[PDB]
Amino acid sequence: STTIQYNSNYADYSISSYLREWANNFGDIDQAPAETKDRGSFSGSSTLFSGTQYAIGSSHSNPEGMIAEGDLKYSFMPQHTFHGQIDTLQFGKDLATNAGGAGKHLEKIDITFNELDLSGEFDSGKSMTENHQGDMHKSVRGLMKGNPDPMLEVMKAKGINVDTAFKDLSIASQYPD
């Protein structure tokens, strides 16, 4: 089952209120110019467009960031679809690089989803419109564009209550203080 760990400073927030705050501050990646448009980084595999971790911070001089872990694949040219399976999804602030030999961490961890089972399939013979409708792609793309609604819809479809405060959510445990 999906469970959640949360920093006690967010005990009164819900998934919805937290992600709306996080996404507003992360901002829309597509409104950043190339020089500062940070498309994130993969680690965990010896190749460029896939990995066991994907980490991305705001392109708008704000500290918000998110980390996904799982079997993470990006189809690159020509359909640019994120697919595979996200097992862990973490939101917070202040991404920093781990020691080399590797990946990133959030210096301020706010919310972590454990065993999220957020997946998407890619079929090169389907259109870009259809491939972009996979749960993993639409939800992560939306967050990158400052829009938490697709991820919230995916979480509701998983039976996760996105309106309950973390302190009252039966699947959520506070991080120790």
Side-chain angles (χ1 to χ4, degrees), residues 1-34 36-38 40-120 122-177:
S1 303
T2 304
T3 62
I4 296 168
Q5 295 171 272
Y6 69 93
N7 185 286
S8 66
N9 291 330
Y10 297 96
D12 294 342
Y13 283 63
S14 60
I15 293 163
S16 185
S17 72
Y18 177 86
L19 288 179
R20 290 193 202 112
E21 185 183 275
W22 182 96
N24 180 63
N25 290 324
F26 186 91
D28 183 356
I29 189 173
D30 290 327
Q31 298 280 35
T36 42
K37 178 168 190 183
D38 187 340
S41 172
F42 286 106
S43 67
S45 299
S46 56
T47 200
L48 193 49
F49 289 119
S50 67
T52 59
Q53 189 189 81
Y54 173 66
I56 187 181
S58 174
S59 298
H60 293 279
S61 320
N62 288 338
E64 280 70 19
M66 62 166 176
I67 297 181
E69 284 174 355
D71 178 17
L72 316 175
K73 295 170 195 181
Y74 177 73
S75 79
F76 193 42
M77 298 167 179
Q79 298 205 33
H80 298 277
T81 301
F82 197 45
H83 65 103
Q85 180 153 319
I86 295 173
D87 293 321
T88 310
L89 184 62
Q90 184 176 81
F91 294 87
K93 288 96 185 191
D94 295 325
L95 279 175
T97 295
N98 305 344
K104 296 205 185 166
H105 61 277
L106 289 155
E107 292 189 346
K108 294 181 172 171
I109 293 164
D110 297 342
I111 314 293
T112 304
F113 296 85
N114 293 315
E115 195 198 292
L116 184 59
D117 195 12
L118 169 55
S119 71
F122 180 71
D123 184 345
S124 73
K126 296 185 169 199
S127 67
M128 241 189 288
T129 295
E130 303 164 75
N131 283 308
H132 295 166
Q133 289 307 327
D135 287 340
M136 171 169 171
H137 183 87
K138 86 173 175 81
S139 64
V140 170
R141 176 70 171 155
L143 287 165
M144 293 174 64
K145 298 185 54 60
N147 178 12
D149 287 352
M151 178 70 71
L152 293 168
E153 291 295 324
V154 163
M155 288 174 175
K156 285 187 288 184
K158 286 175 170 291
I160 295 163
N161 187 316
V162 300
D163 294 308
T164 302
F166 288 109
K167 66 190 180 173
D168 291 315
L169 191 52
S170 59
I171 65 163
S173 295
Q174 189 205 287
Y175 281 118
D177 287 311

